[PDB]
Amino acid sequence: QNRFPVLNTAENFRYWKDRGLDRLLPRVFPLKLPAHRRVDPLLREYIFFLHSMDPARFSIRKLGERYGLKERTVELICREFSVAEFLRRTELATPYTRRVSREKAVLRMKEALFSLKLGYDQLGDEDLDEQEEHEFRGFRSTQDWIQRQNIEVEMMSAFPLPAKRNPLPKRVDVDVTVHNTPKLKVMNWIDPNDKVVF
C-alpha cells in the first residue's frame, strides 16, 4: 500500500521481537559483561604503568585512543589495578581471600568462564564518542515528556505552517564552593529566580 524501504518504520522498529504467541516461548540470551574486565589482564598492567609514569604525556584521553577505550572505562582499570597490587606488596591479604559483596563474586566467575570458552580480548572494541542513532533504550525514549503526547497531529497544507511554541528551560537552585578550610567549609546558595544580582 505504501513504499518506504528503510529501517526506522513502525513495523521495523524493535526488530527480532516476539509479536504473538512466541512471547511466552523461553529463549536464551547472551550474558552481558563490562568492557573493563574482558580485556587481557596483561594489557591492564601495561596501561596502568603508563598512567602512573607520566600523566602529562600519557593523558586519560590519549591513552584510551590507541587501545580503543572510553574515557570512563580506562579510569576504572587504573583504580581496580592499584588496589590489587597494594595488598600484595604490603603482604596484607590475597586477592582471592578479599571480602566483597556477592554481586562482584558472580561477576568474577563470568569473567573466568568468558575466557575459558572464547578467550581474553587483546584490544578493546568500542567507540570513544557516542553517535546519534535510532535505537530502543527503555520505555522512556519513545515518549515526549514536554508536551505529554504520543501521537502528533498537524494540518496538511503546502503553504508554510506556523511553527509551534518552543519550551523554556527549567530554573532550579544549585550550590557552589567559595572558601574551603580544614576546619570549615563555606558555600554559596544560588537563586536564579532573583532579579537583583548584587
Binding site: V106, E130, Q131, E133, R137, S141, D144, I146, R165, N166
Partner: protein
Amino acid sequence: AHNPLPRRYPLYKHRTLFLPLSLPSYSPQPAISGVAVAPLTITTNAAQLPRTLLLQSAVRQLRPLSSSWLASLATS
C-alpha cells in the same frame, strides 16, 4: 523515604541509568561552524552525544551583552 532494590530472581544484572531528553526547541536551528546540530532521533540516552556537546559548549561563550502601498515598496 525509600530504597528501591530488586526482590526477585534477577538480583544481579546490568541496570543502566536512563535520562529522557526531548527536543530542546522545535524551531529550525542552523549549523554551527558548518557542523550540523539538528536533532536526528528522539531517543537519547543519559550520556551526552558529541553533536549536542557542541551546541551547549558555544552557549556559555555567548555573553549576555548585546498613493498606494505597492508603489512605496518598489521605491525603497
